[PDB]
Amino acid sequence: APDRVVETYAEGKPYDLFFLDVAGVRLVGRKTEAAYPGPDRDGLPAERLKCALVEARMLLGVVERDQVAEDHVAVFHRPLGEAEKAELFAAAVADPTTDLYYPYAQLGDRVRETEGWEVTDESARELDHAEEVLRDHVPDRLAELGFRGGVAYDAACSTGAFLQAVGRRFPGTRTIGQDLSPAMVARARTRLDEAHCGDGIRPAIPEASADLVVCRHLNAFVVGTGQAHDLLAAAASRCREGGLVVLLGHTPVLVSSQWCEMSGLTPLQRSGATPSGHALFQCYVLRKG
Amino acid sequence: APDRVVETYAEGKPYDLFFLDVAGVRLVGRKTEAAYPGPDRDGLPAERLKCALVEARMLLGVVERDQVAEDHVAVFHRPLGEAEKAELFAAAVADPTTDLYYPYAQLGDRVREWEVTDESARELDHAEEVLRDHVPDRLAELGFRGGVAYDAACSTGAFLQAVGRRFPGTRTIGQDLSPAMVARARTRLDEAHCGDGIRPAIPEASADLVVCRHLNAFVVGTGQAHDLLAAAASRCREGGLVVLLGHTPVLVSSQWCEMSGLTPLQRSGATPSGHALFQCYVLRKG
Ligand SMILES: N[C@@H](C(=O)N[C@H]1CN([C@@H](C(=O)O)c2ccc(O)cc2)C1=O)c1ccc(O)cc1
Ligand SMILES: N[C@@H](C(=O)N[C@H]1CN([C@@H](C(=O)O)c2ccc(O)cc2)C1=O)c1ccc(O)cc1
Numbered sequence A: 001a002p003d004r005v006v007e008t009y010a011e012g013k014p015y016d017l018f019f020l021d022v023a024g025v026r027l028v029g030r031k032t033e034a035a036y037p038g039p040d041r042d043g044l045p046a047e048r049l050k051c052a053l054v055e056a057r058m059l060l061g062v063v064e065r066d067q068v069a070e071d072h073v074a075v076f077h078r079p080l081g082e083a084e085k086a087e088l089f090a091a092a093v094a095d096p097t098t099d100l101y102y103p104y105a106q107l108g109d110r111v112r113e114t115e116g117w118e119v120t121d122e123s124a125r126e127l128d129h130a131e132e133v134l135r136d137h138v139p140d141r142l143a144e145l146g147f148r149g150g151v152a153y154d155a156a157c158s159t160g161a162f163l164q165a166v167g168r169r170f171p172g173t174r175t176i177g178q179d180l181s182p183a184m185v186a187r188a189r190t191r192l193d194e195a196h197c198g199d200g201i202r203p204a205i206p207e208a209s210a211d212l213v214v215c216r217h218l219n220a221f222v223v224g225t226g227q228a229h230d231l232l233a234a235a236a237s238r239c240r241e242g243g244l245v246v247l248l249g250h251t252p253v254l255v256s257s258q259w260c261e262m263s264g265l266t267p268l269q270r271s272g273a274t275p276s277g278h279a280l281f282q283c284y285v286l287r288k289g
Numbered sequence B: 001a002p003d004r005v006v007e008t009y010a011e012g013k014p015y016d017l018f019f020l021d022v023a024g025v026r027l028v029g030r031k032t033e034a035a036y037p038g039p040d041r042d043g044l045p046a047e048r049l050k051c052a053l054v055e056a057r058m059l060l061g062v063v064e065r066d067q068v069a070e071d072h073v074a075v076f077h078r079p080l081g082e083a084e085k086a087e088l089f090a091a092a093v094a095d096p097t098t099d100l101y102y103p104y105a106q107l108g109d110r111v112r113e114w115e116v117t118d119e120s121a122r123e124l125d126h127a128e129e130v131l132r133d134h135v136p137d138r139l140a141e142l143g144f145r146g147g148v149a150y151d152a153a154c155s156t157g158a159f160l161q162a163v164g165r166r167f168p169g170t171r172t173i174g175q176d177l178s179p180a181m182v183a184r185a186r187t188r189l190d191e192a193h194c195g196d197g198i199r200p201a202i203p204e205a206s207a208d209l210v211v212c213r214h215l216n217a218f219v220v221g222t223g224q225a226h227d228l229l230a231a232a233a234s235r236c237r238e239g240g241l242v243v244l245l246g247h248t249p250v251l252v253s254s255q256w257c258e259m260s261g262l263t264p265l266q267r268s269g270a271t272p273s274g275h276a277l278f279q280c281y282v283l284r285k286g
């Protein structure tokens, strides 16, 4: 017996249906608010945050097909037992090449409300807070994948917090940020070696001059799909051959790992796990060929 | 390295992206005009017609994932050579449980836009010739013994008449929304009743075969197709057969039929040559 999960375009959230590429099948689930940043301790329930994190309890089933209608999207799956949910998730957590993706990220009415970002200090602290798990995982993981400093470039550095954490992990690395918003640059001048204002489609640094390129904005509610591709190409062109390009998102990343492959960017990592194994999140680490 | 097939919503045809499920392995293609009704011959090129038929040459690759964006739909896939296309297409022809479906059929602008003449009725019948010539035979092979046959959107009556030809003694009862269609169908069926299939013209669980050739792109919407399937399949006896086909893509999934208590015995049918496949959901009612 198959089952169906549905998200409508008007009131629903198609971008909350996620696929996990595990054991040569696709598992579908529906993101809800996760235990953040880590799992619940005894007598101390973790904050619940809608964010990059998905958990095993959010899984639903093994995908057979989808159906994309005039007013909703449906995924037909074989529902998973609660035990296999845990096992398949553990297997994903054990293998950072596991893809995690959101194929309807740009589908529906809510994402059309996208309109750079001039925010208050508190709003900026909230942006930073939802990327804490990312700032704690990626730097160490870049080291495990062989990064040894150099020049690091964030093509949409917002507050500068993320690239600042890369710099701290790798002493002597020059941190170069760029952001469309002048207000953001003002904030990042306090944390980066360089902070440039301008649309990332016109990169502020020369071609093949960066050892690491970071893009945390090619996401739903930030840019559109074709925009995300053009911005990836501009950012990746700043990476030298053999360098690393990293794509992350608080909201779903709009570029597929397949498109990355097509662009000559080899995925060395597609997802990351919290240290407890309780949650997974998109983490595309790509080698520039 | 993967490749990507795109259909845009404004000018593209997302309904022409088709998928084959050859035993868990998913293939994607783009439908073009097909050799109709059968393969090219020695000195005769076949007619080429945009219809229910797909061929191996229209396949593209092994599905990796899709991406349904704000202005287009994309499928990423591992490209296939023509020989492996034909090899995989052969295995599909050899297993009629293979699913053939069009998951973006109702996506985009073109699809968001029947009291016809005998010239139009004749063109309607022509694009369905390959279905009339081979589904009834297939139904015999699957054990259909006759009885009462009901077409919930009988149009001209040509299709349900082909059923009656194949199983003499079967009582043929058609319903159609269009009064003009009923007038044609009355000259081909035992009965022809005018009215929306949502109010079926025969009693519940009184038919041994129920036919729907209208739950499809450019005919009804998605919600309508599910409502009309429910009405039509209530007319089918337990152990009877529900058959869904379409010149244009069928909007109901075989998974939705299983959730509705209808077991797929077959999901696609092939031309006698094995040159082409068409959607052919034959469901046993539970
Ligand atoms: N302007 C901000 C904005 O539109 N938030 C929306 C998207 N969302 C949640 C929802 O709809 O359930 C959500 C959150 C995370 C997730 O993974 C999925 C859904 C909002 O709330 C914004 C802030 C930071 C950012 O990186 C991008 C956008
Ligand atoms: N009013 C007729 C109509 O709108 N035809 C449209 C759909 N189409 C072709 C196209 O768009 O390339 C096409 C044809 C078959 C196919 O499998 C895929 C695409 C048209 O032309 C009509 C006639 C019979 C019927 O059962 C339903 C609709």
Ligand SMILES: Nc1ncnc2c1ncn2[C@@H]1O[C@H](CSCC[C@H](N)C(=O)O)[C@@H](O)[C@H]1O
Binding pocket: A116, A117, A127, A128, A131, A155, A156, A157, A158, A159, A178, A179, A180, A181, A184, A198, A199, A200, A201, A216, A217, A222, A223, A231, A249, A250
């Ligand atoms: N075309 C573009 N070029 C450079 N920066 C851009 C851009 N489009 C959006 N941005 C920047 O991307 C940032 C949002 S990325 C989403 C926020 C992220 N989670 C965070 O923690 O900061 C904003 O600062 C915005 O100014």
Ligand SMILES: Nc1ncnc2c1ncn2[C@@H]1O[C@H](CS)[C@@H](O)[C@H]1O
Binding pocket: B114, B152, B153, B154, B155, B156, B175, B176, B177, B178, B181, B195, B196, B197, B198, B213, B214, B219, B220, B228
């Ligand atoms: N709700 C409905 N009930 C019965 N017939 C219907 C219908 N909607 C469309 N049709 C009928 O199906 C045919 C096109 S394939 C045509 O003869 C039309 O009158």
